[PDB]
Amino acid sequence: STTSEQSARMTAMDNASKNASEMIDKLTLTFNRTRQAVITKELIEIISGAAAL
Amino acid sequence: TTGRIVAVIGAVVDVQFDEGLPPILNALEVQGRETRLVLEVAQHLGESTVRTIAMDGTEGLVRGQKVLDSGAPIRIPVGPETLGRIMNVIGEPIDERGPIKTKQFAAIHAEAPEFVEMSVEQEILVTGIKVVDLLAPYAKGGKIGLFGGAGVGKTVLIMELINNVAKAHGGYSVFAGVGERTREGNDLYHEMIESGVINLKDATSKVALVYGQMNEPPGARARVALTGLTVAEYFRDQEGQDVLLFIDNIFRFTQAGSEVSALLGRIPSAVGYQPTLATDMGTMQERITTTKKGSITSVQAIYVPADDLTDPAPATTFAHLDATTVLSRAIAELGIYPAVDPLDSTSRIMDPNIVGSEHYDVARGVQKILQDYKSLQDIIAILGMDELSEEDKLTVSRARKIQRFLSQPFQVAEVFTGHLGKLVPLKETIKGFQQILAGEYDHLPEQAFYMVGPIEEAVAKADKLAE
Amino acid sequence: VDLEETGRVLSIGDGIARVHGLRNVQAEEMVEFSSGLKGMSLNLEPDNVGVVVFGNDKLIKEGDIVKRTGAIVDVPVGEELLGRVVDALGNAIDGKGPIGSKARRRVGLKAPGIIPRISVREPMQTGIKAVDSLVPIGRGQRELIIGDRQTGKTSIAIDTIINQKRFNDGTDEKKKLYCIYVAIGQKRSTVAQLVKRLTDADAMKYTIVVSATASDAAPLQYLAPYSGCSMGEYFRDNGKHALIIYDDLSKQAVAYRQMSLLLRRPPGREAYPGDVFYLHSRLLERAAKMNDAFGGGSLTALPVIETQAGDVSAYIPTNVISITDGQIFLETELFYKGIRPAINVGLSVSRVGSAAQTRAMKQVAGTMKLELAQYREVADAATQQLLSRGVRLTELLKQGQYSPMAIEEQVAVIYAGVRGYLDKLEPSKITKFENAFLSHVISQHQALLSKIRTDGKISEESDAKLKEIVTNFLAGF
Amino acid sequence: KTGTAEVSSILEERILGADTSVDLEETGRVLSIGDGIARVHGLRNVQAEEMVEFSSGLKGMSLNLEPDNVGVVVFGNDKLIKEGDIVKRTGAIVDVPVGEELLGRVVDALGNAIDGKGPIGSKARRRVGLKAPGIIPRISVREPMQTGIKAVDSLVPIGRGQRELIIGDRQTGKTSIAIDTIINQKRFNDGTDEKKKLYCIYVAIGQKRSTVAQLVKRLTDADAMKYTIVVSATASDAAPLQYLAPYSGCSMGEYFRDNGKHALIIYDDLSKQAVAYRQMSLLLRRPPGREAYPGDVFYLHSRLLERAAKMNDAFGGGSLTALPVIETQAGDVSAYIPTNVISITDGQIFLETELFYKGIRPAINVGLSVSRVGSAAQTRAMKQVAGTMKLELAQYREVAAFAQFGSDLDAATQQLLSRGVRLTELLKQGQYSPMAIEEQVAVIYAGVRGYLDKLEPSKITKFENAFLSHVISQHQALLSKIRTDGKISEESDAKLKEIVTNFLAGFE
Numbered sequence A: 001s002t003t004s005e006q007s008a009r010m011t012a013m014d015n016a017s018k019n020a021s022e023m024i025d026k027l028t029l030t031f032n033r034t035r036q037a038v039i040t041k042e043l044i045e046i047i048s049g050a051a052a053l
Numbered sequence B: 001t002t003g004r005i006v007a008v009i010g011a012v013v014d015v016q017f018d019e020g021l022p023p024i025l026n027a028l029e030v031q032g033r034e035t036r037l038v039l040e041v042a043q044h045l046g047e048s049t050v051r052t053i054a055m056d057g058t059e060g061l062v063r064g065q066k067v068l069d070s071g072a073p074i075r076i077p078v079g080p081e082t083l084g085r086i087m088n089v090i091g092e093p094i095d096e097r098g099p100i101k102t103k104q105f106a107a108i109h110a111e112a113p114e115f116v117e118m119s120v121e122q123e124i125l126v127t128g129i130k131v132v133d134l135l136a137p138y139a140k141g142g143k144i145g146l147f148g149g150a151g152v153g154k155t156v157l158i159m160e161l162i163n164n165v166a167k168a169h170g171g172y173s174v175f176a177g178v179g180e181r182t183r184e185g186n187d188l189y190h191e192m193i194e195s196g197v198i199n200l201k202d203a204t205s206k207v208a209l210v211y212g213q214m215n216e217p218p219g220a221r222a223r224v225a226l227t228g229l230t231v232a233e234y235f236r237d238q239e240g241q242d243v244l245l246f247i248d249n250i251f252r253f254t255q256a257g258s259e260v261s262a263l264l265g266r267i268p269s270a271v272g273y274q275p276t277l278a279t280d281m282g283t284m285q286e287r288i289t290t291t292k293k294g295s296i297t298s299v300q301a302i303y304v305p306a307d308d309l310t311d312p313a314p315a316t317t318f319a320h321l322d323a324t325t326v327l328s329r330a331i332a333e334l335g336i337y338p339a340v341d342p343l344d345s346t347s348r349i350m351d352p353n354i355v356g357s358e359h360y361d362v363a364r365g366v367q368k369i370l371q372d373y374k375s376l377q378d379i380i381a382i383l384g385m386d387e388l389s390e391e392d393k394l395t396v397s398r399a400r401k402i403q404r405f406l407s408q409p410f411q412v413a414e415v416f417t418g419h420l421g422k423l424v425p426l427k428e429t430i431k432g433f434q435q436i437l438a439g440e441y442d443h444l445p446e447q448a449f450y451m452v453g454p455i456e457e458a459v460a461k462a463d464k465l466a467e
Numbered sequence C: 001v002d003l004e005e006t007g008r009v010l011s012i013g014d015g016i017a018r019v020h021g022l023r024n025v026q027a028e029e030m031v032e033f034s035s036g037l038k039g040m041s042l043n044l045e046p047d048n049v050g051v052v053v054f055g056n057d058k059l060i061k062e063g064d065i066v067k068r069t070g071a072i073v074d075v076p077v078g079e080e081l082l083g084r085v086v087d088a089l090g091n092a093i094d095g096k097g098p099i100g101s102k103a104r105r106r107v108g109l110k111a112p113g114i115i116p117r118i119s120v121r122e123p124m125q126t127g128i129k130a131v132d133s134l135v136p137i138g139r140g141q142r143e144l145i146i147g148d149r150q151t152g153k154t155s156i157a158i159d160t161i162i163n164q165k166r167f168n169d170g171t172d173e174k175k176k177l178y179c180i181y182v183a184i185g186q187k188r189s190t191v192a193q194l195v196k197r198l199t200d201a202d203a204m205k206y207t208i209v210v211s212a213t214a215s216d217a218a219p220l221q222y223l224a225p226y227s228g229c230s231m232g233e234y235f236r237d238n239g240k241h242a243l244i245i246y247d248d249l250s251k252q253a254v255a256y257r258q259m260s261l262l263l264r265r266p267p268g269r270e271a272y273p274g275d276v277f278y279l280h281s282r283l284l285e286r287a288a289k290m291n292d293a294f295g296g297g298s299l300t301a302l303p304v305i306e307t308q309a310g311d312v313s314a315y316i317p318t319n320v321i322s323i324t325d326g327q328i329f330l331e332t333e334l335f336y337k338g339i340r341p342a343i344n345v346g347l348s349v350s351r352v353g354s355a356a357q358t359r360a361m362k363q364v365a366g367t368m369k370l371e372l373a374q375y376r377e378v379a380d381a382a383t384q385q386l387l388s389r390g391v392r393l394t395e396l397l398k399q400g401q402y403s404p405m406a407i408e409e410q411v412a413v414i415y416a417g418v419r420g421y422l423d424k425l426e427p428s429k430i431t432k433f434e435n436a437f438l439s440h441v442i443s444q445h446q447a448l449l450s451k452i453r454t455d456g457k458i459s460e461e462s463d464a465k466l467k468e469i470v471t472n473f474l475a476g477f
Numbered sequence D: 001k002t003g004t005a006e007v008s009s010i011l012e013e014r015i016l017g018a019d020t021s022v023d024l025e026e027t028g029r030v031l032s033i034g035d036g037i038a039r040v041h042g043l044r045n046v047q048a049e050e051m052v053e054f055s056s057g058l059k060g061m062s063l064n065l066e067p068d069n070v071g072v073v074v075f076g077n078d079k080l081i082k083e084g085d086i087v088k089r090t091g092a093i094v095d096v097p098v099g100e101e102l103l104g105r106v107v108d109a110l111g112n113a114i115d116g117k118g119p120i121g122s123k124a125r126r127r128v129g130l131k132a133p134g135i136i137p138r139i140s141v142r143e144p145m146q147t148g149i150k151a152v153d154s155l156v157p158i159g160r161g162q163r164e165l166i167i168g169d170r171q172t173g174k175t176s177i178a179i180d181t182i183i184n185q186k187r188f189n190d191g192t193d194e195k196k197k198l199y200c201i202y203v204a205i206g207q208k209r210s211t212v213a214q215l216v217k218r219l220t221d222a223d224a225m226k227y228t229i230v231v232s233a234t235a236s237d238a239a240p241l242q243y244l245a246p247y248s249g250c251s252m253g254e255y256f257r258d259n260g261k262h263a264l265i266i267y268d269d270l271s272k273q274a275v276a277y278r279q280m281s282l283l284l285r286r287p288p289g290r291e292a293y294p295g296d297v298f299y300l301h302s303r304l305l306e307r308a309a310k311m312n313d314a315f316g317g318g319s320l321t322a323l324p325v326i327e328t329q330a331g332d333v334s335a336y337i338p339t340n341v342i343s344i345t346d347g348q349i350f351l352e353t354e355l356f357y358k359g360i361r362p363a364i365n366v367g368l369s370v371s372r373v374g375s376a377a378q379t380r381a382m383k384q385v386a387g388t389m390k391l392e393l394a395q396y397r398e399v400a401a402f403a404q405f406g407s408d409l410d411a412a413t414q415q416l417l418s419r420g421v422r423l424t425e426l427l428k429q430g431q432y433s434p435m436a437i438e439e440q441v442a443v444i445y446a447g448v449r450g451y452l453d454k455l456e457p458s459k460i461t462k463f464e465n466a467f468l469s470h471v472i473s474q475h476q477a478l479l480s481k482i483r484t485d486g487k488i489s490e491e492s493d494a495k496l497k498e499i500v501t502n503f504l505a506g507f508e
């Protein structure tokens, strides 16, 4: 039982790490999109304020 | 024609021409200046006024200073006498070795070759480097992106490419440094002098440097890539040969363009870049092509902001790249040189229709075996080497031999490796890797493949170290 | 100086000249500058005129003389353009002589209304097994090709163009398709190589190529799609069929964003103006399918979009997905893995072409689609069978490059695959079997394929003979 | 359209021919004044960035020369300036005094003493806006700039003529790195070796006056003012002074560089000079860019930092090291000014708050820190020990995740964890207690040869101290040999071996 349990824990941790890696990839893509969008939004606010004087 | 400076806002200068206006992109020289100041026209505001971006510090200018219209855009001295000479964006030498004497001058604002001045067939540029020529061949007249760029061999690789291209095909090269650190610029000058690609005595240089310093106004760092293109276009058209053009860095090209656009008073685009980002890049990258006379193969060092591959700068540059090289810190650790990531490197012409079926099959087999070894390394780390089969230990051995064989000794690094540099032709590389994949050399030791030229050198090394 | 039919450039800069004069210039009219360029007069203002220059602003100077041509922006159209490359204004750039066209069409002409059109009823054959069986494209449809950098979209377009030769070499005037290829913001090297590839496949004699490569000013990249769409509307309104391939429609959006920002317009989301949706819908609404009271012609459209990192829910991809009649999602993961064409049949759909599919292909591809759909959900006994069959089909739909297939060969191959003849063949050898089987049927049994093509269905006798052929060949393999 | 000089007063003057009695070439009349920006009519013969002087005794820098008017930025409160005032040319671009007469003096951005110790000697003057050297005058960075900090000198070496960058968050230790670097140079300045003396300049942009006063007290306590200049541009100072102070410091250091001596300039903090320039640009109605910063803000810092050079012997051989400090907000090294200055400089000392509280002070985060100069800026002995230390630390950083588990892992990983923990406890340093290079090399040599694999990690900080005091007292000949020689000779290696073993033989 202990041998099989340790094998299963190794497999489960490997799969969990793989899933966390896929989720990290997706969230990194989302974070980059959001960061660029925030830069653009702040810059457009500044531009509109400057041109609206 | 003579005008007057009417306004000076930062690096932007508004001039007034009572007689006749210069066309856009012309170069104007400010009279009454201790050091040559050149202004590039960018707008026609009306009322005979033009707005110009300054190529040098505008401090000390007065409203009324006379400005003389040259009549043509920035014209630089191009020819065979620029080889081994550093010169800034406006063509003035900055290496203090006297004037760049030439009988030719070229305007830096030219147009891409017309649709009929274009090679219709792809080609391959043989650089004499195993990894580059096998896993990511460099298309002739195609942009190559080069990643990494920190203590991994970027400069030594650039120098080796210069040497091989000037030795195999005999073409010269240009090194346009866009926004170049002065410390690193001087260091590079001296490294080139040491390795021999520049010769201050006998005039047998193989590279012409063009430095856009990092402390020049934004209007100068934005145009040095064009000066480099002009120096290389001379060799392509006039000398009718294949040139190399190293642009280090291209992200700094985009940054300088963005700063100039902001200074002129233009609304920024998506991430605060110039609204003309795509065209600003395209006008330059479209002059690096294979005309029917010669060709220019460019090598951009590329920086990815925030490690974001979708940022408008690399998202726009990657649209132009025809290949990719990825120097990796993780491979210089292993002592492999050049530390080119065999798997992350990419090429558009790695296609059986272009590079031929045998080259394509060898490259695909090498990539597959390297991926297999990479996958197996996890099993080795976790379950221990014992767990492998006999049809997997063999692949591990073959992949280690291939990794060793992909390393090479450079001619411009004989003071780092104690060996003598090798310029491996293409057929030698393909045959060597085909033989290693076939298994013909499974009996040799792995270290017999480390840092050798063609496969026959591996055989000789095995004989010399076993006997 | 005549201040009615002529003006003087007040201020050049940004690629938007301000002219003073032209008191009788119509909105959206084309004017000609002294140097040789041409421009379009957007902003008829009280005191000046805002002309966007279709070229490089370097050539224009303050003081230059602008002369109105007297006609709205239009391009030369006709049969005379087939086999020629042309810039965004219809001026030839392949140096084979003057274009010499008799008819001129406006680029801003409006799309046909609701009554002229009719449902899509004819198939547009692409010679790509995945596209023709799983996401069929009819004639008059607008099928977006959306993907990433280097995933094989231009390959789909060029395979379609090269495949149309079976019909453009025959005699049936109702099947000939005249292709148009618009290249926007795209390396000129690529356009030249593509034109050579077409010339080598004898596919230029019925193809127009409009070029707005990356070295061309933003207004030309903005205006190239409309020039191409007018060149195709000529055939559409004359009872002939056309196929226009905008490539890409994201480079056009970038060019239009440049144009708008330089005009100081309020940037919106991702700095794109508010007109981008209108910019593209104005264009893709012209790919209609006229009814027999208007000629019966058609104009297919295959816009191409390059997503960024696989983001399909971006702004411009979603606009063009809200404009078009389907999708062909090319997945980068699949492409790098080895599946090519990398069409992600899960997310790729065809709104309209399903009814236009050919019966012979329709019956076989129905069961192919069911089998692939079942396999998609399981990736014991039934599960193992589904995995095996799905892998067989997936390796069956891999295809070469620049080697389009006639519908009959696709029918034969997919029939062999879906009827379980390959259920024993090792999954790796499916491609080898496919290439050998195609040669076999293309050499000896031309009668069967010809009968399938003519009858337009897999009749029971055709079914039996095909069964015999495939089983015998599989025995001898 | 409209101009700012079309006000009815100017037109009134010009209609009735009253514009000929006013000298509009060397004098001007303020049209507008607000938020520290004056718009002046006249001054037709005024140069860009020239200094004008208002009637009320104030100064200003004329930045925006437009067709109608001149945009002057006032060097102080605009309370004293009123519309209609008279502004006179000074004739000269802004310059500052320079020389050894500044050493030990606190000055403001314009070279005026503010410590109340009397006038400032000031034999020579120098323009703040002077172009940096070129490709040719410089030569590669070879000499070391002894920081006195074990981490910085071992794993992030700083040469002379290099532009490092102390980038970190708020309250992590950046000013402490700077002050320890300044204080460690006393052992060289006191001595007689004339090519090791380093003169220090501390530019304090945007800090409150109490901070600078405490800093000056700290330097005086350590007797490290006699070779230090401090240039204060505190928060109450007008934006132009905060903008200029880095350039005044850089010119006061370029003086030392041009005359064969060596200088160290610590622009602390550059992210506040950027803010001051942003203010000036926005109030001059210049087109903003990302984060509202002007377009030429990369130019502002590049033309400043590219004056840190290592002249060659044909020019004097002097040098000017630069240590710009930047405060990142959360960890964002991808922001605008952090990005610019990371792309301008030659390395970076990246400080942490996770490491600061985990007990690793100074919080230099190796792995993110880098020095593109590297071993070229190290002594032979420091090279010898630091190569192994860096290799071992790199090995330790990729198995530090297991540090919690540690046990139930192979012996190699256990050894890596143990050696890494010992080395990290070794790189810990006090505050304002720099160490000579011989001391550092002795300590790191003891650490990296395994002679601490027996001591418990909690006791390494006490070992280091006791062992260092031992060697410093009993064994001066060996330390002097290592120092003057510069390398570890085989006999010196044996002496270090025996010393470390004998002291460790009984430590308890």
Ligand SMILES: Nc1ncnc2c1ncn2[C@@H]1O[C@H](COP(=O)(O)OP(=O)(O)OP(=O)(O)O)[C@@H](O)[C@H]1O
Residues within 6 Å of the ligand: B348, B349, B350, B351, C147, C148, C149, C150, C151, C152, C153, C154, C155, C156, C306, C340, C341, C399, C400, C401
């Ligand atoms: N069916 C296929 N089989 C094998 N290889 C293919 C196939 N289709 C495309 N490729 C490969 O993909 C590469 C890029 O193809 P393609 O130009 O069609 O993609 P793209 O999206 O048009 O590229 P870009 O986005 O750069 O214009 C080609 O070099 C080709 O070798």
Ligand SMILES: Nc1ncnc2c1ncn2[C@@H]1O[C@H](COP(=O)(O)OP(=O)(O)OP(=O)(O)O)[C@@H](O)[C@H]1O
Residues within 6 Å of the ligand: D168, D169, D170, D171, D172, D173, D174, D175, D176, D177, D327, D361, D362, D363, D429, D430, D431
């Ligand atoms: N190596 C060290 N050992 C012990 N204390 C330290 C060390 N380094 C810094 N400190 C302490 O941490 C506190 C903050 O340090 P310091 O002010 O130098 O960082 P800082 O980033 O300059 O702060 P700020 O940037 O907000 O001015 C100080 O009180 C200092 O005494």
Ligand SMILES: Nc1ncnc2c1ncn2[C@@H]1O[C@H](COP(=O)(O)OP(=O)(O)O)[C@@H](O)[C@H]1O
Residues within 6 Å of the ligand: B149, B150, B151, B152, B153, B154, B155, B156, B157, B337, B338, B408, B409, B410, B413, B416, B417
């Ligand atoms: N072929 C090679 N043989 C030996 N050493 C090499 C080789 N290529 C790179 N290196 C090593 O890489 C280091 C960095 O070199 P270089 O690329 O010139 O600096 P940078 O990467 O900063 O441009 C050098 O110290 C050199 O020893």
Ligand SMILES: [Mg+2]
Residues within 6 Å of the ligand: C153, C154, C155
């Ligand atoms: Mg394409």
Ligand SMILES: [Mg+2]
Residues within 6 Å of the ligand: D174, D175, D176
């Ligand atoms: Mg501080």
